[PDB]
Amino acid sequence: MHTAEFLETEPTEISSVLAGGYNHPLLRQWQSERQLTKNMLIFPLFISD
Amino acid sequence: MHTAEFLETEPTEISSVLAGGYNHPLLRQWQSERQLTKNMLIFPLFISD
């Protein structure tokens, strides 16, 4: 019978763990290099004669 | 009579001109590498027993 195989593992390496930095909604905002604000928006206008 | 002296000048060098980038309120905001938002604030709390 085909059974689920699990390879022998080694203790987790600290350098592998990145998950601690984006497991929460607020965190995903903190991870942004720049946050989108209304004053960054430039609206184009097509003025006719 | 002491009069205001003005030294002979050379044409303005383009590389000298930085003023075009912050002569307006909005521009001073655009010049910011990061804008301050409410979600960047962390308020400390002193919980007593």
What is the distance between the alpha carbons of residues A14 and A9, in angstroms, rounded to a whole number? 14
Q: Which residues of A touch B43 (CB under 8 A)?
A: none
Name the method of structure determination. Answer: X-ray
- Total CB pairs under 8 A between chain A and B: 17
- 8-state DSSP, A24: S
Alpha carbon of residue B17 to chain centroid: 14
Length of chain A: 49
What is the token pair recorded at B27? 């521009």
Q: What is the distance between the alpha carbons of residues B31 and B11, in angstroms, rounded to a whole number? A: 27
Q: A35, A42, A46: which is closest to B26 by C-alpha?
A: A42
* Stated resolution in angstroms: 1.6
Taking CB atoms and an 8 Å limit, are B26 and A35 in contact across chains? no
Question: Would you give the distance in Å from CA A47 to the centre of its chain?
Answer: 40
